[PDB]
């Protein structure tokens, strides 16, 4: 066991999924830090160093990392793999990014199984000496992710279907909402230029009042102020922060992908009174 195979990912969700597949034969690090906004992140010379010292680079694609392709052009002789191949996208509904794939596909546990398979294939291709380990670790982790879906689905099924309105800041939950039958309301369709401008806030407020939706949420990498303004003006409580674009730090309450899905579902369910 000389030097461990080095994997660099764009963001933290992919870091943790890949690290479960890598086990003890590879070390996986994220370019973005926990809590950092990932869509419009501005890479630094230090990020170039980290990616250039890697043996493999993993990214989401599907219009997530607006910075990645320009950044990767500075990197020489390091293979990359997009981890979302084979996932059917949901289009973004409105705004200047309307009609392109919504990148947040990892919020569906079923889609996470495809992330796992794509990461496994990339590690086996670029580090074939450890293929048996990657295959073993991917099978075990896929078992955990597959089993995760049933209790989450049952928990959210307790909310009456007519009342299943998921009101968030970024429209980052479209894949989770599809899986579990929630209608989707948001202050902005995807992180970008305008987040909480008028017109956006007014539309969400109107839907909340028309349907008597009991709760609204924010997310861990963006401002909570728009959601709190919406809750102040309506009958909805502020349900707290959902985790989608980043894990917490490893000593925080959301250290892993499994913890992120569980925490987000638990926070939604509690917002609805379980
Ligand atoms: Zn996002």
Author numbering: 38 to 311
The authors write:
By varying the protein-expression conditions, we observed crystallization of YfeA in three crystal forms. In this report, the lattices with edges 42 × 52 × 113, 62 × 66 × 67 and 55 × 67 × 82 Å will be referred to as crystal forms 1, 2 and 3, respectively. The structure of crystal form 1 was solved by single anomalous dispersion (SAD), and the structures in the other crystal forms were determined by molecular replacement (MR). free of 17.88 and 19.03%, respectively, and used for MR and refinement of crystal form 2 and crystal form 3. The high-quality diffraction data enabled the resolution of holes in aromatic and proline residues. Although this observation suggests that the primary ligand at site 1 is zinc, further inspection was needed as nutrient-rich conditions contain unequal abundances of free metals in solution, and zinc is the most abundant transition metal in LB. The inter­atomic distances of site 1 ligands are 3.0 Å ≤ x–x1 ≤ 3.6 Å. Based on this analysis, the interatomic distances of site 1 ligands can integrate zinc, iron and manganese, further supporting the hypothesis that YfeA site 1 is polyspecific.
YfeA is a polyspecific cluster A-1 SBP that is important for Y. pestis infection and transition-metal homeostasis. Biochemical analysis indicates that the Yfe system transports manganese and iron, and complements their respective transporters MntH and FeoABC. At the arch of the c-clamp is a tetracoordinate canonical site composed of His76, His141, Glu207 and Asp282.
